[PDB]
């Protein structure tokens, strides 16, 4: 059966961190739902790229659960995710069922906000480290991608391919990840 991914898209999301994982996961045969935090309408990302979500988060939640929940970064996107009761519920449920949670750049600060994955080894964008580490609830890593069990984190736009391929490997295996990687012309 095909794996399913929920990508939560908030105003101020980093568009590269949104699009690269969506595209790469779709290349891997994953059924991806781009879910609008605020509803069904187009989302203005951090650098003003406007993406039309596949569905509202409210609607996508009804089709859960998902094999991965993905949180893009962008400061303002991550803040919107961090402030959302709907996101809290989704992540709690995902953690409780031992489903994968993936977050990049400032995205992992939403895990802190929602008390998800405490004790995990995590990375973030360098500028988000102090926020993530407030209280010492995680252990910090400078690895480009950090996977500690079902908490998968990464650092920035420039680690987005690695992040996406790590998700692919987690869901569909090493060989599919390698197959998807080769046509991308990665270094």
Which residues does the annotation mark as catalytic? 105, 125
User: Using the rule CB under 8 A, is 59 a contact of a copy of itself?
Assistant: no
32 vs 39: CA distance, rounded Å: 17
41 vs 33: CA distance, rounded Å: 14
Give me 123's structure tokens.
Answer: 């990375």
Handedness of CA 48, 50, 53, 54 (dihedral sign): negative
Name residue 145's beta-bridge partners: 154
Give me 8's structure tokens.
Answer: 């939560």
Residue 53 or 77: the one with the smaller Cβ distance to ligand 73D is 77
Q: Per-residue string for binding with Cl ion, 19-48, x by CB under 5 A?
A: ---------------------------x--
Who contacts 34 (Cβ-Cβ below 8 Å, separation ≥6)? 7, 9, 18, 22, 51, 53, 54, 55
The number of residues that bind a copy of itself (CB under 8 A) is 33
Part of the chain binding a copy of itself (CB under 8 A), chosen from 18-26, 56-64, 90-98, 168-176 = 18-26
DSSP-derived pairing of the beta strands 55-56 and 151-154: unpaired
Q: Of these, 74, 108, 117, 156, which contacts Cl ion (CB under 5 A)?
A: 74
Q: How far is the CB of 101 from Cl ion (least distance, A)?
A: 21
DSSP-derived secondary structure letter, 144? S
Q: Of these, 36, 77, 108, 156, which contacts a copy of itself (CB under 8 A)?
A: 156
141 vs 99: CA distance, rounded Å: 22
Interaction site with ligand 73D (CB under 6 A): 14, 17, 73-75, 78, 105-106, 125, 127-128, 156-157, 183
User: Using the rule CB under 8 A, is 127 a contact of a copy of itself?
Assistant: yes
Please give the residue ranges that form the binding site for a copy of itself (CB under 8 A): 14-16, 19-20, 22-23, 26-27, 34, 42, 46-52, 125-127, 144, 155-159, 161, 183-187
């Amino acid at each position: 059966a095909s794996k399913r991914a929920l990508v939560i898209l908030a105003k101020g999301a980093e568009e590269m961190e949104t699009v690269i994982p969506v595209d790469v996961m779709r290349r891997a045969g994953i059924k991806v739902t781009v879910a609008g935090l605020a509803g069904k309408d187009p989302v203005q990302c951090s650098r003003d790229v406007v993406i039309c979500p596949d569905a509202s988060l409210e609607d996508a939640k009804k089709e859960g659960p998902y094999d991965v929940v993905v949180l893009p970064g962008g400061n303002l996107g991550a803040q919107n995710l961090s402030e959302s009761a709907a996101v809290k519920e989704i992540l709690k449920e995902q953690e409780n069922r031992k489903g994968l949670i993936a977050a990049i750049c400032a995205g992992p600060t939403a895990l802190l906000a929602h008390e998800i994955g405490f004790g995990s080894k995590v990375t973030t964008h360098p500028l988000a480290k102090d926020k993530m580490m407030n209280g010492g609830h995680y252990t910090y890593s400078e690895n480009r991608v950090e996977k500690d069990g079902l908490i998968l984190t990464s650092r920035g736009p420039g680690t987005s391919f690695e992040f996406a391929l790590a998700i692919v490997e987690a869901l569909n295996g090493k060989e599919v990840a390698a197959q998807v990687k080769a046509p991308l012309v990665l270094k």
